[PDB]
Amino acid sequence: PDDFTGCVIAWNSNNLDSKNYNYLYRKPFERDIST
Amino acid sequence: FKNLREFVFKNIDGYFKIYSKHTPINLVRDLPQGFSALEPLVDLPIGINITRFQTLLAAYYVGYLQPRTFLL
Numbered sequence: 001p002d003d004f005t006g007c008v009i010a011w012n013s014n015n016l017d018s019k020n021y022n023y024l025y026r027k028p029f030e031r032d033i034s035t
Numbered sequence: 036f037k038n039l040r041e042f043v044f045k046n047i048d049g050y051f052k053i054y055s056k057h058t059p060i061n062l063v064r065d066l067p068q069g070f071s072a073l074e075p076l077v078d079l080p081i082g083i084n085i086t087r088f089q090t091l092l093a094a095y096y097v098g099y100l101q102p103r104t105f106l107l
């Protein structure tokens with residue numbers, strides 16, 4: 001949302017997830033999982 | 036009919052809000068003429084897209100909500 005209230009927290013996972021092709025990508029909080 | 040149950044179902048930004056009101060009636064025709072306001076009871080953070088719905092089974096009525104101003 002443009003009027004979003006909250007906090008965004010992020011950190012590197014280069015030593016955790018990287019190896020890795022198991023992460024896929026292409027309204028507010030719309031979660032479209034259609035294939 | 037002996038009992039009237041009214042609900043409002045709206046789904047905004049992933050939140051499904053349910054409002055309702057129960058009251059006794061004595062009428063075998065249609066919705067009684069009169070006024071009452073419904074109150075929120077349940078808020079389900081579903082994240083689910085809703086475009087259609089169905090009722091599971093006693094008559095029921097379906098109307099649609101519009102973004103109109105009211106003086107309450």
Ligand SMILES: *[C@@H]1O[C@H](CO)[C@@H](O[C@@H]2O[C@H](CO)[C@@H](O)[C@H](O)[C@H]2NC(C)=O)[C@H](O)[C@H]1NC(C)=O
Binds near residue numbers: 030084085086
């Ligand atoms: C909820 O589902 C409806 C379909 O039932 C989506 O409406 C379609 O959106 C696509 C966008 O590319 C259009 O091409 C279709 O023509 C639309 N269909 C109809 C019947 O209008 C709607 O976008 C979905 N909404 C969310 C938030 O997921």
